[PDB]
Write a protein that binds this ligand. Sequence first.
Ligand SMILES: CCCCC[C@H](CC(=O)NO)C(=O)N1[C@@H]2CC[C@@H](C2)[C@H]1C(=O)N[C@H](C(=O)O)c1ccccc1
Ligand SMILES: [Zn+2]
Ligand SMILES: [Zn+2]
Length: 201
Amino acid sequence: AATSRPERVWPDGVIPFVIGGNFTGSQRAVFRQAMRHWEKHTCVTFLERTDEDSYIVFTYRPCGCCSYVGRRGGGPQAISIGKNCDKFGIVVHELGHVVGFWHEHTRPDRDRHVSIVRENIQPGQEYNFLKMEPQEVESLGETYDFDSIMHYARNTFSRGIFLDTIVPKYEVNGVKPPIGQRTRLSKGDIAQARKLYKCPA
Ligand SMILES: CCCCC[C@H](CC(=O)NO)C(=O)N1[C@@H]2CC[C@@H](C2)[C@H]1C(=O)N[C@H](C(=O)O)c1ccccc1
Ligand SMILES: [Zn+2]
Ligand SMILES: [Zn+2]
């Protein structure tokens, strides 16, 4: 689920960054590797911020709200990295938001691909499962990507770990497709990022 709005797309795919204070050297290196991981497979580029007006700030802060999708413009935008959301794959997910990706399970067509088990959602967190409105999103021809780094796990915001909130609707290669990986960018994440930033083939 890529943003459909041209203004949230970072010009030339160049995203300047600041790493804020209070992080360990170790944590700082993981941020660098996460940005690099985006660069290895796409034409998106992360540059140390010199005098750019719009840029991202890795901010030492409790995990949660909110990661702006794409380029907000007219100033810095913060990425909240705390104790429990500082691992490489989580950072790659957050940088997914930064480059212009919503959560995959909120695609306007998601109901053809997953069931949402409402009764299992933590009360007050159901808004996290609302479909994006169709004007806000573009698929760019990409199929629903169960493997996306932007896809929720089976039990995200569940009342308990053994209760599913998201259940894929069909089998892929004889098997119910696994969801919620935070290891690397999927084939789909790369293909969709390349399309959104018009990366040379
Ligand atoms: C229980 C609290 C829920 C936190 C919201 C979510 C956190 C996330 O996904 N982190 O990786 C988020 O920040 N979101 C949702 C997923 C992508 C969008 C929606 C992002 C969000 O709220 N974006 C806003 C926007 O881009 O319009 C926004 C972010 C920051 C400031 C203002 C608006
Ligand atoms: Zn997210
Ligand atoms: Zn994808």
